[PDB]
Amino acid sequence: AKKVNWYVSCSPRSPEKIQPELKVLANFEGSYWKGVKGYKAQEAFAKELAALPSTRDRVAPMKTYGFVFVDEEGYLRITEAGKMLANNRRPKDVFLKQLVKWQYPSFQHKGKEYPEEEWSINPLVFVLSLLKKVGGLSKLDIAMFCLTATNNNQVDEIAEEIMQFRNEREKIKGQNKKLEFTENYFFKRFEKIYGSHKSKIETKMRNARDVADATTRYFRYTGLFVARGNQLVLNPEKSDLIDEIISSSKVVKNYTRVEEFHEYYGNPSLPQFSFETKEQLLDLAHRIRDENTRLAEQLVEHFPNVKVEIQVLEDIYNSLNKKVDVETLKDVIYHAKELQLELKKKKLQADFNDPRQLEEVIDLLEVYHEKKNVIEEKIKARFIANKNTVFAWLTWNGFIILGNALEYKNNFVIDEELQPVTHAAGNQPDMEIIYEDFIVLGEVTTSKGATQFKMESEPVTRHYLNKKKELEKQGVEKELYCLFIAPEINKNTFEEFMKYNIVQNTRIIPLSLKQFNMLLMVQKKLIEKGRRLSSYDIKNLMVSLYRTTIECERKYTQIKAGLEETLNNWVVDKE
């Protein structure tokens, strides 16, 4: 069949899950991977991969992005880029270079299915060029206009097409009217592309939306794209790099034979960018240093928890006193950008001095009281991420609002402008908030009732108990607490956590969403008076709420009334 769309695999739909897969797979280099002989190694790979906290489907994206291949002699090979990713060496940069070289046709996609007459496109560079024209693209815009683009020369065509669709769309007045126009236009377009019947043309529309979701996750992971509202846009801090990616991008023709193609495609040094010399990488390293220094110096007086990053900045750059080569500079540049992201988290503290920025987080959190239909439409209008990940994102902004932490360790994925992308892994809490003399894990859910009990009871207590174990191994002498936050906390989930606190020595504190927002309103009201919560105030809240859970008499009614009692004493104390 002649394909009419390119796609980003949803297995996994988020790219940070590839590294553990590929690390497992690298143990199978030199194994035979094709034909009757190949069956043995592939099943062994599935057995080991399973232990992580269909095989053909799992490998296909690692073939698509140039991490692995099968040589003409049939053996499994790991490209150099695959070697870098498996070793977790600058993984976001590996993905950027691989996804820039990514092309149709390729070794994975060639022949009759993808004839040169139709196919000549670098998917990511295409969206870069398109974005230049149309400013932003929602996931739906990607599902409608971008997946069916097959050639880099359609940028202007589709750019013009999108502006006409949007100008006609605006003329429709009422939101519900606009949905019909959008779904019909979407329906009509896929009918000419892919031409009961209704389901077949509808399933293609659903798949387009599922693929556009993974596409946004993979593109934002490169850093070249961020999210503004529910729209994918170019990263304004990457403008010069984007221009050079567009100008130097190409579809190579030497893709029919596997060795010749992956000599190019598997090389993570390619494309080599202009600034990737020792001289210009020194400039880039220093330019990032002055950006981070400016960021920290603006905050250090009112927010001395930025000293954490200041000291890490120093550790990173003092490597350059030992060696000044291209590899060390790239490590210096990559770590300093991660550290810049941490400084932006601390910077949010200063922004939240503005009450409307602070009140934004509170009002966004109140949406979750609303029925499920109201929440999804309100979140989809303002975020690319799903409503569950955004809840973790809001609660994590809530902690930033309260202040005083040395580290606001989100475990869910954010992009280069701190917007949410993907949920936290299942073997990790949604966030870890590290203070000077205590740690607070954050676990949130939008689920209710019996599904909430099944969904959270074991993962929450497991995350707490694993973190406690790891703190002891590390020798960190800090009390560990966990805040469990849901719009409505199920009775059974509450009582299982109370059991764990008193029987297994956990320190899990269930707060309703209403009670978590109460903490934000208290801090908001203190900022109006020129005051703010101290680290002590937050520690005192955790200790007291924890003491209530193990000292109150073993009655769900009395412990719940005690927690509200303890919380109201802390709030009245702030006056």
Side-chain angles (χ1 to χ4, degrees):
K2 184 249 273 160
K3 301 296 261 114
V4 293
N5 67 81
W6 53 274
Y7 117 119
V8 175
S9 174
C10 302
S11 318
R13 72 181 56 249
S14 57
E16 72 294 345
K17 298 170 83 166
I18 283 189
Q19 190 279 339
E21 290 185 324
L22 174 51
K23 175 169 197 55
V24 174
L25 183 63
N27 307 322
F28 295 66
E29 201 275 349
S31 299
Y32 207 87
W33 210 255
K34 196 198 229 298
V36 306
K37 299 174 174 297
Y39 300 147
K40 187 187 192 177
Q42 304 195 25
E43 256 284 8
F45 162 58
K47 174 142 190 210
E48 179 181 343
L49 154 66
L52 300 168
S54 155
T55 300
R56 166 172 87 75
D57 295 320
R58 295 300 228 185
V59 172
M62 293 181 277
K63 281 184 179 184
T64 309
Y65 305 138
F67 298 133
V68 306
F69 66 92
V70 182
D71 60 6
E72 301 187 343
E73 301 86 359
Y75 296 89
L76 178 64
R77 305 297 174 197
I78 314 294
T79 65
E80 304 298 338
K83 282 168 189 141
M84 269 189 75
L85 182 50
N87 289 131
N88 227 19
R89 295 199 292 252
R90 307 197 294 270
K92 287 177 165 180
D93 284 341
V94 168
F95 263 94
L96 188 157
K97 291 230 187 143
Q98 297 306 121
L99 286 187
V100 164
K101 291 180 296 198
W102 184 33
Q103 59 173 55
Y104 286 80
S106 65
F107 180 67
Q108 263 286 290
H109 310 275
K110 52 171 199 324
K112 91 211 119 331
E113 247 175 313
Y114 307 88
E116 293 177 350
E117 305 95 43
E118 174 167 35
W119 285 92
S120 204
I121 187 169
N122 311 101
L124 185 148
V125 192
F126 173 87
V127 183
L128 285 176
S129 305
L130 172 54
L131 225 19
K132 290 245 220 100
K133 296 294 220 146
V134 307
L137 298 159
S138 52
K139 283 187 290 174
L140 189 54
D141 298 350
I142 298 169
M144 291 178 45
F145 300 100
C146 296
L147 300 181
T148 55
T150 58
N151 194 319
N152 292 324
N153 59 18
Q154 313 185 253
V155 168
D156 297 341
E157 178 219 300
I158 290 161
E160 274 304 337
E161 218 215 328
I162 292 172
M163 304 286 88
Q164 161 146 109
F165 164 76
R166 286 177 181 173
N167 268 327
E168 303 298 296
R169 170 175 214 272
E170 170 166 53
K171 308 232 111 77
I172 329 320
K173 304 104 285 149
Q175 295 294 339
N176 285 331
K177 223 174 145 39
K178 305 217 216 212
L179 297 204
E180 290 206 350
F181 177 43
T182 292
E183 177 86 356
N184 249 279
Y185 188 111
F186 196 3
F187 187 101
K188 291 170 110 227
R189 174 191 204 77
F190 269 24
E191 142 195 314
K192 315 184 205 184
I193 299 274
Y194 296 88
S196 169
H197 182 62
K198 211 88 167 189
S199 182
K200 293 181 180 179
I201 183 81
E202 269 174 352
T203 296
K204 298 289 161 114
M205 299 164 76
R206 237 213 314 301
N207 288 335
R209 281 186 286 247
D210 292 2
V211 169
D213 173 25
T215 299
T216 56
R217 307 191 189 219
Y218 276 70
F219 286 8
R220 292 164 77 191
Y221 189 74
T222 73
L224 300 173
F225 308 76
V226 296
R228 255 144 195 229
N230 75 339
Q231 292 205 305
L232 189 77
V233 299
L234 302 178
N235 183 344
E237 300 190 340
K238 303 284 168 114
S239 291
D240 287 332
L241 179 70
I242 293 171
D243 287 350
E244 181 168 349
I245 288 180
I246 295 181
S247 294
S248 79
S249 67
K250 56 174 140 40
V251 182
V252 305
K253 339 284 183 298
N254 57 269
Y255 63 83
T256 313
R257 287 245 245 238
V258 52
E259 298 283 354
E260 181 173 12
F261 190 56
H262 294 86
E263 264 184 15
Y264 162 77
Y265 191 43
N267 186 338
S269 292
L270 294 184
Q272 194 207 338
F273 296 129
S274 60
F275 55 82
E276 290 188 309
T277 67
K278 171 167 103 180
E279 297 75 24
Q280 298 180 52
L281 286 167
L282 274 169
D283 303 343
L284 178 57
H286 290 325
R287 184 185 326 150
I288 297 174
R289 184 74 144 122
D290 293 352
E291 293 171 4
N292 294 345
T293 300
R294 280 163 213 144
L295 226 39
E297 276 170 355
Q298 286 160 3
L299 305 157
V300 68
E301 194 187 350
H302 283 348
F303 299 106
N305 50 3
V306 306
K307 319 250 187 178
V308 169
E309 289 75 8
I310 289 178
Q311 184 52 59
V312 177
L313 261 90
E314 187 79 4
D315 292 328
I316 293 168
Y317 278 86
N318 266 275
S319 309
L320 299 180
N321 281 322
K322 288 71 139 168
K323 321 215 291 293
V324 193
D325 61 348
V326 161
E327 190 66 11
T328 305
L329 282 165
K330 293 183 168 187
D331 288 328
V332 167
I333 287 171
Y334 189 99
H335 293 325
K337 288 254 63 179
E338 291 191 290
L339 215 50
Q340 181 176 117
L341 202 73
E342 296 291 285
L343 280 163
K344 317 257 261 264
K345 295 169 177 186
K346 295 294 177 56
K347 176 179 190 201
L348 286 181
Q349 295 176 135
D351 303 345
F352 284 131
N353 293 332
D354 182 6
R356 61 176 195 82
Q357 285 254 29
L358 198 161
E359 187 55 40
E360 265 180 45
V361 179
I362 299 181
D363 297 323
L364 289 175
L365 273 165
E366 223 83 23
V367 177
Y368 289 78
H369 287 130
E370 292 290 307
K371 299 229 179 164
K372 192 188 190 112
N373 41 287
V374 181
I375 304 176
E376 309 206 33
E377 288 315 294
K378 284 216 189 163
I379 300 309
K380 289 172 186 185
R382 300 174 191 76
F383 300 95
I384 302 194
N386 73 52
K387 73 187 183 52
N388 293 335
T389 290
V390 174
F391 196 62
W393 182 80
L394 290 171
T395 302
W396 168 86
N397 282 280
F399 281 101
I400 291 176
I401 284 176
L402 301 170
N404 312 288
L406 307 172
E407 185 177 351
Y408 304 94
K409 188 197 164 206
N410 55 294
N411 289 319
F412 53 88
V413 179
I414 61 179
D415 68 16
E416 300 290 291
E417 293 205 343
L418 279 45
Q419 300 295 310
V421 187
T422 307
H423 65 275
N427 60 324
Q428 279 206 313
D430 307 321
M431 60 212 75
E432 187 186 354
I433 312 305
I434 303 179
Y435 303 85
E436 261 276 346
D437 52 339
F438 63 110
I439 300 179
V440 183
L441 300 184
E443 306 268 35
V444 310
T445 180
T446 59
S447 62
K448 264 148 157 172
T451 299
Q452 171 182 112
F453 189 20
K454 164 225 83 58
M455 203 177 119
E456 302 296 325
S457 200
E458 183 270 344
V460 165
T461 66
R462 171 168 56 87
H463 297 146
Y464 183 98
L465 283 180
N466 283 334
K467 195 63 197 188
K468 175 161 182 169
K469 177 103 197 166
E470 191 192 18
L471 293 172
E472 278 163 345
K473 308 219 237 173
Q474 270 158 332
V476 169
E477 318 233 17
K478 300 180 177 182
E479 315 171 300
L480 179 63
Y481 305 82
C482 172
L483 267 194
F484 186 82
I485 300 154
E488 206 211 89
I489 296 185
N490 183 237
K491 184 223 208 210
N492 301 329
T493 310
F494 192 96
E495 298 192 27
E496 188 85 8
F497 290 152
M498 295 310 102
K499 266 204 203 59
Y500 260 88
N501 288 354
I502 210 171
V503 176
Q504 318 263 1
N505 203 17
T506 68
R507 305 193 169 196
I508 300 165
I509 299 167
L511 285 189
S512 79
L513 166 63
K514 169 128 157 290
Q515 292 166 329
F516 184 72
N517 241 9
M518 236 191 266
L519 311 182
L520 306 183
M521 308 182 232
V522 161
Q523 173 82 325
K524 185 188 181 226
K525 288 166 179 300
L526 296 170
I527 295 173
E528 305 178 344
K529 306 182 172 191
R531 273 196 292 157
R532 71 192 208 191
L533 297 164
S534 63
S535 200
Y536 169 83
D537 294 325
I538 300 170
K539 184 166 142 126
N540 183 71
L541 179 63
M542 301 299 101
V543 178
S544 64
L545 290 175
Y546 161 63
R547 300 314 296 192
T548 304
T549 56
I550 59 177
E551 293 173 7
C552 262
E553 78 143 343
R554 307 294 88 191
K555 272 266 124 173
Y556 164 74
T557 300
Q558 296 297 282
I559 306 176
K560 206 177 96 197
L563 279 177
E564 184 70 36
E565 202 185 331
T566 304
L567 163 91
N568 173 266
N569 286 337
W570 183 90
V571 173
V572 171
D573 180 278
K574 304 300 166 300
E575 87 182 43

